[PDB]
Amino acid sequence: DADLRRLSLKNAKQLLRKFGVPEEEIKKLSRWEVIDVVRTMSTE
DNA sequence: TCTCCAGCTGGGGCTATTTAAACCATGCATTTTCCCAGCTGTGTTCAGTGGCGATTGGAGGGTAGACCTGTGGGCAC
Numbered sequence: 001d002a003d004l005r006r007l008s009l010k011n012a013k014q015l016l017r018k019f020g021v022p023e024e025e026i027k028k029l030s031r032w033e034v035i036d037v038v039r040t041m042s043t044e
Numbered sequence: 045t046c047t048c049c050a051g052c053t054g055g056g057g058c059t060a061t062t063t064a065a066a067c068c069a070t071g072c073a074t075t076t077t078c079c080c081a082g083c084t085g086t087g088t089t090c091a092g093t094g095g096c097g098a099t100t101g102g103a104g105g106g107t108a109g110a111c112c113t114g115t116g117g118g119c120a121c
Contacts, residue, residue, distance in 0.1 A: 005092055
């Protein structure tokens with residue numbers, strides 16, 4: 001959960017693009033919602 | 045004869061050379077200093093997260109109530 005802060009929104013956006021997350025979530029670009037979604041996707 | 049004048053007849057001041065001394069003017073060139081700009085470092089603030097605490101929800105256990113079955117007693121043939 002920690003290194004997900006160092007993701008520093010922009011690289012987390014690129015990671016969500018890499019996993020295949022739909023563009024709406026990426027579009028929101030939440031600093032907290034984005035990291036929760038990428039933690040969920042890395043759990044999936 | 046004496047005075048004046050007027051030309052002219054032989055006489056003095058330019059030029060050329062070397063040298064040192066101390067001096068000057070007129071933009072020029074160089075060196076120094078001051079100022080401004082940029083880059084780096086440190087400090088502060090903000091916000092993420094960690095972490096912990098509290099509240100809510102779910103599950104399990106216990107107690108209470110109700111229903112069903114069994115036994116006993118009373119009554120009737």
